[PDB]
Swiss-Prot record:
Protein name according to UniProt: Diphosphoinositol polyphosphate phosphohydrolase DDP1
Cofactor note: Binds 3 Zn(2+) ions per subunit.
Purpose of the protein: May eliminate potentially toxic dinucleoside polyphosphates during sporulation. Most active against diadenosine 5',5'''-P1,P6-hexaphosphate (Ap6A). Can also hydrolyze diadenosine 5',5'''-P1,P5-pentaphosphate (Ap5A), adenosine 5'-pentaphosphate (p5A), and adenosine 5'-tetraphosphate (p4A) are also substrates, but not diadenosine 5',5'''-P1,P4-tetraphosphate (Ap4A) or other dinucleotides, mononucleotides, nucleotide sugars, or nucleotide alcohols.
Entry similarity comment: Belongs to the Nudix hydrolase family. DIPP subfamily.
Membrane-crossing residue ranges in chain numbering: none
Keyword rRNA processing: no
């Protein structure tokens, strides 16, 4: 396909965004396409031509969440551990939300909502995605 893999581990290379309000009190979440009651964050597979992970992250944040903003931090990598090597290596960025658009590519396939840190953390546990929670915890979100 168009997907890129680690030459070392064969992990699927993915990038996405922890999208925060300017006041850093809320994070943007979306429902999963697979599990429609589970709330996650925007991310997706790096494609063959893309020159950096920021490109992939901002493309997926537009496609999946209708969100435009400014990358303000590199949150490093997290690895997903497919239980009984990693098959996913995620590259996360912190984005400062500049606009949320009513219409975007996946707007009929997903719901979208801003959550406080407490609500977001319970969502990601509920979704069984501790690696996305790892990325959220590295962001400048207010954890009060
Ligand atoms: N914990 C996980 N770690 C890594 N990959 C996962 C995990 N859970 C599911 N996946 C796979 O990652 C891909 C996307 O799953 P998910 O993160 O739920 O996003 P999505 O909103 O469903 N997008 P998509 O299904 O690709 O259109 C699928 O191939 C899943 O099987
Ligand atoms: N492709 C994947 N790579 C890595 N981790 C994954 C992948 N698919 C699922 N996981 C994770 O592995 C765990 C088990 O996932 P899964 O078997 O899909 O459970 P489920 O969708 O919650 N179904 P169930 O618990 O039986 O009702 C979860 O923590 C997932 O996030
Ligand atoms: N990009 C990253 N990749 C991996 N681990 C990280 C990363 N950023 C931070 N950490 C670690 O994760 C934990 C939380 O990180 P951070 O967001 O810097 O806040 P903190 O640890 O509470 N504060 P401080 O120890 O003063 O830097 C710490 O153990 C960090 O060393
Ligand atoms: Cl993904
Ligand atoms: Mg994609
Ligand atoms: Mg995907």
């Amino acid at each position: 396909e168009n997907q890129v893999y680690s030459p070392v581990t064969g992990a699927r290379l993915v990038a996405g965004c922890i999208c925060l309000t300017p006041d850093k009190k809320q994070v943007l979440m979306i429902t999963s396409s697979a599990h429609k009651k589970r709330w996650i964050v925007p991310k997706g597979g790096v494609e063959k031509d893309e020159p950096n992970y920021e490109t992939t992250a901002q493309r997926e944040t537009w496609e999946e969440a209708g969100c435009i903003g400014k990358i303000v931090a590199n949150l490093g990598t997290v690895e997903d551990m497919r239980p009984p090597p990693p098959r996913t290596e995620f590259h996360f960025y912190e984005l400062e939300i500049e606009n949320l658009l009513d219409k975007f590519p996946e707007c009929h396939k997903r719901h979208r909502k801003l959550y406080s840190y407490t609500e977001a953390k319970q969502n990601l546990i509920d979704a069984k995605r501790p690696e996305l929670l790892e990325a959220l915890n590295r962001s400048a979100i207010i954890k009060d």
